[PDB]
Amino acid sequence: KEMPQPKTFGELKNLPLLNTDKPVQALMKIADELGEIFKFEAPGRVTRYLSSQRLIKEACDESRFDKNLSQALKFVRDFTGDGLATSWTHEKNWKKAHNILLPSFSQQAMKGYHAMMVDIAVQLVQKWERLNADEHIEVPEDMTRLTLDTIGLCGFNYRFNSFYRDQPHPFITSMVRALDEAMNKLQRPDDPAYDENKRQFQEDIKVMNDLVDKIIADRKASGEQSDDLLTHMLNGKDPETGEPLDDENIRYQIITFLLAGHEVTSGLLSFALYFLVKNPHVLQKAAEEAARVLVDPVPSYKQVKQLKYVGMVLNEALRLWPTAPAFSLYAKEDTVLGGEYPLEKGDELMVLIPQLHRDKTIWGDDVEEFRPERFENPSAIPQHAFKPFGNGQRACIGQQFALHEATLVLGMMLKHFDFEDHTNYELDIKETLTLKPEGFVVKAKSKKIPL
Amino acid sequence: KEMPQPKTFGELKNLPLLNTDKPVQALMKIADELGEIFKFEAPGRVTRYLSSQRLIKEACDESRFDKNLSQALKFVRDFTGDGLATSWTHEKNWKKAHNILLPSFSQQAMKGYHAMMVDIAVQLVQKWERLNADEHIEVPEDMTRLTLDTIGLCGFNYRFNSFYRDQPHPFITSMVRALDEAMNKLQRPDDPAYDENKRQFQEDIKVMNDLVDKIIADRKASGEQSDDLLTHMLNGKDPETGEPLDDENIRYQIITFLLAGHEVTSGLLSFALYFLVKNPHVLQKAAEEAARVLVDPVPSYKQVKQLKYVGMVLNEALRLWPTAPAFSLYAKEDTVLGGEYPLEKGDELMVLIPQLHRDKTIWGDDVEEFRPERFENPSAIPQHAFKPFGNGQRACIGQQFALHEATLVLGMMLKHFDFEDHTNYELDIKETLTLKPEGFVVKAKSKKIPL
Numbered sequence: 001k002e003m004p005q006p007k008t009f010g011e012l013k014n015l016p017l018l019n020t021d022k023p024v025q026a027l028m029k030i031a032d033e034l035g036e037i038f039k040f041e042a043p044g045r046v047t048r049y050l051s052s053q054r055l056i057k058e059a060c061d062e063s064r065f066d067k068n069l070s071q072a073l074k075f076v077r078d079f080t081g082d083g084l085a086t087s088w089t090h091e092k093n094w095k096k097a098h099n100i101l102l103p104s105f106s107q108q109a110m111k112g113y114h115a116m117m118v119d120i121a122v123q124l125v126q127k128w129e130r131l132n133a134d135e136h137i138e139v140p141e142d143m144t145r146l147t148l149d150t151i152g153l154c155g156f157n158y159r160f161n162s163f164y165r166d167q168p169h170p171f172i173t174s175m176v177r178a179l180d181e182a183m184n185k186l187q188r189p190d191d192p193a194y195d196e197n198k199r200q201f202q203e204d205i206k207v208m209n210d211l212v213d214k215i216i217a218d219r220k221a222s223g224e225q226s227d228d229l230l231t232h233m234l235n236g237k238d239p240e241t242g243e244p245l246d247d248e249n250i251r252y253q254i255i256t257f258l259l260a261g262h263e264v265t266s267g268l269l270s271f272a273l274y275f276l277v278k279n280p281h282v283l284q285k286a287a288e289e290a291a292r293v294l295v296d297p298v299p300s301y302k303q304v305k306q307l308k309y310v311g312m313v314l315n316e317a318l319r320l321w322p323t324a325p326a327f328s329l330y331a332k333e334d335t336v337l338g339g340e341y342p343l344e345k346g347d348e349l350m351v352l353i354p355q356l357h358r359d360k361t362i363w364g365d366d367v368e369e370f371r372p373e374r375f376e377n378p379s380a381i382p383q384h385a386f387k388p389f390g391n392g393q394r395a396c397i398g399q400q401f402a403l404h405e406a407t408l409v410l411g412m413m414l415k416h417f418d419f420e421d422h423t424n425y426e427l428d429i430k431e432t433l434t435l436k437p438e439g440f441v442v443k444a445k446s447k448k449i450p451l
Numbered sequence: 452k453e454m455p456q457p458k459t460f461g462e463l464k465n466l467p468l469l470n471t472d473k474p475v476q477a478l479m480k481i482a483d484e485l486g487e488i489f490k491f492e493a494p495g496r497v498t499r500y501l502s503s504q505r506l507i508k509e510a511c512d513e514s515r516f517d518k519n520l521s522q523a524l525k526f527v528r529d530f531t532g533d534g535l536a537t538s539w540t541h542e543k544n545w546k547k548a549h550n551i552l553l554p555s556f557s558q559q560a561m562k563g564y565h566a567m568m569v570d571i572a573v574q575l576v577q578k579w580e581r582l583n584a585d586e587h588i589e590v591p592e593d594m595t596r597l598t599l600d601t602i603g604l605c606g607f608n609y610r611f612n613s614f615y616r617d618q619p620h621p622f623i624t625s626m627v628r629a630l631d632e633a634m635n636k637l638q639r640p641d642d643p644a645y646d647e648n649k650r651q652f653q654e655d656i657k658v659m660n661d662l663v664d665k666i667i668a669d670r671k672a673s674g675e676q677s678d679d680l681l682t683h684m685l686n687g688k689d690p691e692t693g694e695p696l697d698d699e700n701i702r703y704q705i706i707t708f709l710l711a712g713h714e715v716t717s718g719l720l721s722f723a724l725y726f727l728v729k730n731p732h733v734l735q736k737a738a739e740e741a742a743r744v745l746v747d748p749v750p751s752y753k754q755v756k757q758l759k760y761v762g763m764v765l766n767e768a769l770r771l772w773p774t775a776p777a778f779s780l781y782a783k784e785d786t787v788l789g790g791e792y793p794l795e796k797g798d799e800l801m802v803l804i805p806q807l808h809r810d811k812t813i814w815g816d817d818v819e820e821f822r823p824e825r826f827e828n829p830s831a832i833p834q835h836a837f838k839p840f841g842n843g844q845r846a847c848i849g850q851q852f853a854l855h856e857a858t859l860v861l862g863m864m865l866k867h868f869d870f871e872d873h874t875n876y877e878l879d880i881k882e883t884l885t886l887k888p889e890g891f892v893v894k895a896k897s898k899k900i901p902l
C-alpha cells in the first residue's frame with residue numbers, strides 16, 4: 001500500500017537523484033534498495049518506477065495503461081515532434097504513421113533492407129580487417145558508425161559514410177547535441193545561464209529540420225523510388241484515414257529513425273560484444289554459430305535468421321542492458337496496480353527495463369550473469385518479463401530492423417574476427433537517453449576469411 | 452556422402468535390428484560402429500539416425516527441420532492423440548495447447564506445484580524411512596510411484612496413492628500396456644497373431660479415455676479450481692486463437708502428461724540415483740549440497756533451485772541415459788545435412804540422444820564417466836550438444852516440472868539417506884519407449900533427519 005520513495009532534496013524532492021551521469025543505473029540501484037516499485041517525485045511531477053514483472057505485466061496491460069511520454073521523451077519531442085516514438089497513442093499521427101510504417105518494419109521488410117545492411121556491415125568488417133596489429137577497435141563508436149549508416153541507408157538511401165569520418169555528419173552533431181540538451185534538461189531551474197543551451201537547442205532543431213526537410217524535398221523532386229522508409233512514407237497511405245503522412249511528420253519519423261538506429265541499436269551491439277568478450281564460452285559458441293551459418297562471403301537474410309545463438313546473445317545483452325532502458329505509461333483510468341498500489345487516471349509509471357530484466361522471481365538467482373541460453377527457448381520467457389522493445393502497440397517498431405542489423409553484424413563480426421578484450425575493459429555505462437559501454441575497446445584478430 | 456547403413460535382412464531391410472528388447476542401445480551400438488549418421492530402413496520407412504552434435508545441431512535448426520512423429524510416437528498417438536507430444540507442429544491443437552499450457556509449465560508455475568511435489572516426495576522419504584533393516588529399495592519402482600503421483604497430484608489433483616499400492620492404478624495398467632503394445636508394434640505387423648494385441652490395445656485406449664474423460668467431466672461438474680493443469684486447461688484460452696482446448700484434447704494432454712510423468716521422469720531419478728551410487732564422490736558432493744541447502748524439514752521451492760549440483764547430477768544422468776532417448780525430425784525443405792548428406796523435403800531424422808550425449812568431440816574422451824561438473828556452465832556446452840528434452844518449440848514442455856520434481860526428490864533423498872549399492876547392481880537398461888535401470892536396487896540407511 002505505502003509506496004517506497006528514495007531520498008529527497010527538500011523542495012526538489014527526488015529530482016537531484018537524476019542529476020547524475022548514469023540516472024538509469026542510479027534508478028536501478030534505487031530499485032535494488034526499494035524493490036519492485038517506488039515513487040519518484042520531482043517538482044510538479046510524480047512517477048512510479050516499476051521493476052518487477054509482477055507489476056510490469058499489469059502496466060503492460062494496454063486496456064489499463066497507455067504509453068506516456070516521459071519527461072525525456074517530451075524533451076526529445078521538441079525535435080522528434082509527433083514521430084512514432086514521441087507521439088501519444090491518441091494523436092492522429094501515431095496510428096497513422098504506425099499503420100503506414102508497420103509494413104516497412106516487418107520481418108518481411110528486412111529481406112528488402114538486408115542488402116543495404118550488409119553493405120554497411122561489410123564496411124565495418126573491412127574497417128576492422130584493415131586495422132594494424134595492436135590497433136584496437138572503439139566498439140560503441142564503430143557500432144554507432146554501423147547503425148547510423150545502416151538506418152541512413154535503409155531508411156533514406158543516404159550514406160552517412162561514417163566509416164569515412166572521424167567528425168560526425170552535421171545532422172548527427174545537431175541530433176546528438178539536441179539529445180544531450182534534452183537529457184541535460186532532465187537533470188536541471190531554467191536560469192538565464194541556459195540561454196546558450198536553449199539557442200543551441202533551437203539551432204540544432206533547425207539544423208535537423210532543415211537537413212531532413214531537404215532530404216524529403218530532394219526525394220519528392222526526384223521521384224526516385226527506392227526500397228527505403230522515405231519512399232514508403234512518401235507513398236504510403238494509412239488504410240484507416242486513407243491519408244499519407246505529411247512532410248512534417250515524415251521529417252519527425254526520419255529524425256526519430258536516425259535517433260533510434262544512431263545510438264540505441266549500436267548500444268545493443270556494443271553491449272553484446274562486451275558480454276561476448278567477457279564470456280569467452282559464449283563468444284565461442286556464438287562464433288561457432290557464425291562460422292557454421294555464415295558460409296557465404298556476404299550473409300544472406302536467411303542465414304541471418306539462422307543465427308539463433310547470436311540472437312540469444314543479443315537478447316541476453318538486451319536483458320542485462322536494454323539500451324532504451326525505460327518506458328513510461330499512464331493509467332488510462334483509476335486502477336489498482338498489483339492489488340496494492342491504487343493509481344488515479346493519468347498517473348505515470350516508469351518501466352525500469354534493466355530492473356525488470358533482473359527480476360530474480362522471473363530469471364532465477366543468476367540475473368547478472370550473461371547467459372544467452374536463458375533465451376534458448378523463447379517460450380520459456382514469461383509474458384512481459386523481457387521488454388527491451390517496450391510494450392504492445394507502442395512497442396519498438398524497429399525491433400526487427402534492430403535485431404536483424406545486430407544479428408547480421410554481430411554474426412559477421414564473429415565470423416571474421418577473434419576478439420581480445422585486451423584492456424580487461426571495466427564496464428562503464430554511459431547514459432544519454434540510451435546506454436552504451438563507454439570506452440569499450442577490443443582488439444580484433446582477423447580470421448582472414450575474405451568477403 | 453554415402454550414408455552408412457547397418458546390416459539388412461533382405462526385404463525387411465533393417466527392421467529386424469529393432470526386434471530386440473533394447474532397441475535404443477542397439478541403435479547406439481550401431482551408431483558406435485557406423486558413426487554420426489546411418490540410414491535405417493524399414494519396409495516403407497526410411498530414417499536417418501543422427502548421433503553427432505555436428506549433425507544434430509543442424510537437425511535442431513527449426514527453420515529446416517520440424518518435429519516428426521517417429522513410428523513410436525505415431526503408435527503412441529493412438530492413445531495420446533493430438534496431445535502436445537504427439538501432435539504435429541502444424542496441428543491447430545499443438546500451438547493452442549502449447550500456448551495454453553506453457554505458463555503452467557514454467558519455472559514460475561513450479562512454485563505453485565512445489566507443495567504437491569513435496570507431498571509426494573515426503574511420501575517417498577517416509578516410505579524409505581519406514582523400511583526395515585536390510586529391506587532394499589526398488590529404485591525405478593519407487594521413482595515411478597513418486598513421479599506418477601507427482602504428475603497426478605500437480606497434474607489433475609488426483610492421488611494415484613502409488614505408495615499405498617503394489618497393483619498399479621487401472622489407468623496405468625492400460626497406459627503401460629498400451630505403451631508396451633505401441634513399442635511391440637515397432638519390433639513387429641498385420642499378422643493374425645497380433646489381433647489379441649489390437650483388442651487389448653483398444654480396450655486400453657478405451658480405459659484411458661473413459662477414466663480421463665471422467666476426470667475431466669468430474670472436474671467440470673465440480674466447478675472447483677485447483678492450482679493444476681486440468682484447471683488451466685479447462686479455463687485457459689489460447690492467446691492466439693482465443694480458443695480453449697476442447698475436452699478431447701484435454702484428455703490427450705492429461706494422458707500425455709501421465710505418460711510423461713510416469714517412467715520418463717522416474718527414469719531420470721532412477722538413472723541419477725544409479726549414477727550417484729556408482730560414483731560415491733559425486734554422491735557425497737550431491738549429499739553435501741543437499742545437507743547444506745535443505746536446511747528445513749520440507750524443501751522450499753527456493754531451496755530446490757539452490758540444489759545446483761543436484762541439478763547437474765540430473766543433467767549428467769540425462770546426458771548418459773536420456774530417458775526419452777530419441778526424437779524425430781523431418782526436413783521442412785530440401786536441404787543438405789552436414790554439407791554432405793542431401794535430404795529431400797520430408798526426409799526423416801532420428802536424433803539418437805544417448806549417442807549425441809556421447810559425442811567425444813563435445814564431451815571429451817571420458818564421455819562415459821558420470822561428471823555432473825560437465826554441467827557447471829551451460830554456456831560452455833556447445834549448441835545442441837545436450838538434448839535430453841528435445842528441441843526448440845517442440846522441446847519438452849514438462850522439462851522444468853521434471854527437473855524440479857527430480858531435484859526436489861533427489862535432494863531430499865540425498866539429505867535423508869545414505870545409499871548403498873548393496874547388490875553391486877549391474878546396469879540393465881530396460882527399454883519401453885523410455886529407459887530405466889531395471890532391477891536397480893539400493894539400501895538406504897536413514898540419516899535420521901526428521902521431516
Ligand code: HEM
Nearest residue numbers: 084085257260264265268324327389390394396397398402
Ligand atoms: C536495439 C535497438 C532498439 C531498442 C532496444 C529499442 C527500444 C525501443 C523501446 C523500449 C521502445 C518503446 C519506447 C517507449 O515505450 O517509450 C521503442 C519504440 C520505438 N522504436 Fe525502438 N529500439 C531500438 C531500435 C530501434 C530502431 C533501429 C528503430 C528504427 C529506425 C526504432 C524505432 C522505434 C520507434 C519509431 C518507436 C516508437 C514506436 C511507436 O510507439 O509507434 N527503434 N523502441
Ligand code: HEM
Nearest residue numbers: 535536708711716719775778839840841845847848849853
Ligand atoms: C526427465 C523427464 C523428461 C524427459 C527426459 C522428457 C523428454 C522429452 C523430449 C525428449 C521431448 C521431445 C520429444 C520429441 O521431440 O518427440 C519431450 C516433449 C514433451 N514432454 Fe517431456 N520429458 C520429461 C518429462 C516430462 C514431464 C514431467 C512432462 C509433463 C507432465 C512432459 C511433457 C512433455 C510434452 C507435453 C511434450 C511435448 C512438447 C511439445 O511438443 O509441445 N515431459 N519431452
Ligand SMILES: O=C(CCCCCn1ccnc1)N[C@@H](Cc1ccccc1)C(=O)O
Nearest residue numbers: 042045070071072073085186324325326433
Ligand atoms: O530514463 C527516463 C526515461 C528514458 C527515455 C528512453 C528513451 N527512448 C525511448 C525509446 N528509445 C529511447 N527517465 C525519466 C526521468 C524523470 C523522472 C521524473 C522527473 C523527471 C525525469 C523521465 O524522462 O521522465
Ligand SMILES: O=C(CCCCCn1ccnc1)N[C@@H](Cc1ccccc1)C(=O)O
Nearest residue numbers: 493496521522523524637775776777778884
Ligand atoms: O526409438 C525410437 C523412437 C523414440 C521414442 C521417444 C518417445 N518419447 C518422446 C518423448 N517422450 C517419450 N525409434 C524409431 C524406431 C523405428 C525406426 C524405423 C522404423 C520403425 C521404427 C521410431 O519409432 O520410428
Ligand SMILES: Cc1ccc(O)cc1
Nearest residue numbers: 156158171211212215
Ligand atoms: C537521411 C538523412 C540524410 C541526410 C541528412 O542531412 C538528414 C537525414
Ligand SMILES: Cc1ccc(O)cc1
Nearest residue numbers: 085259260264433434
Ligand atoms: C536517444 C533516443 C531517444 C529516443 C529514441 O526513440 C531513440 C533514441
Ligand SMILES: Cc1ccc(O)cc1
Nearest residue numbers: 607609622662663666
Ligand atoms: C488421470 C486419472 C485419474 C484417476 C483415474 O481413476 C483415472 C485416470
